[PDB]
Amino acid sequence: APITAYSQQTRGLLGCIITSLTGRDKNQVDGEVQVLSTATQSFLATCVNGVCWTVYHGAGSKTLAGPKGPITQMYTNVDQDLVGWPAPPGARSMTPCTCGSSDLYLVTRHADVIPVRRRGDSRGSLLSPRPVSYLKGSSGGPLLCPSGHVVGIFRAAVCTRGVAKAVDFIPVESMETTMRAS
């Protein structure tokens, strides 16, 4: 009570680079949320129903390093800024949110879980404003119901003068819409 989270680092800088080049990652994967990195950027992926979902503005068209080699995206939708890869073995897959609660939580890359009030299909307000610097690198992180089901993934921050009052996210309905058209 309530939802809590913690992070575990699995890779160093040099291992990251090499894995980027071979596309081979033999590590045990675990957790609901993966911490991801490219040469220039870090961000998050949320595993929902066997797909690891993240933002296009983080991952572009890239493969994900995997045990059998690089994994090709099974879903790429650029205009909604959503991509997904079939979830590697061991990723804990979450449940889409049904009930419709407007009381949400955003899980950041620092594994903080922060209260968000849903204001619309794709938007929610931070109950406490945070500096933009604190949210950076959290795109792809989950927005959750109090029960722990996923309502969407973090896309962009609404901010002024380095302070974010609200967040824009990709609703889990956009994901199945992609799983429809694709």
Place this chain on the structure above:
Amino acid sequence: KGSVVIVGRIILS
């Protein structure tokens, strides 16, 4: 041009 790489994970309770 490299792959995206999982460098960590977050465990939810």
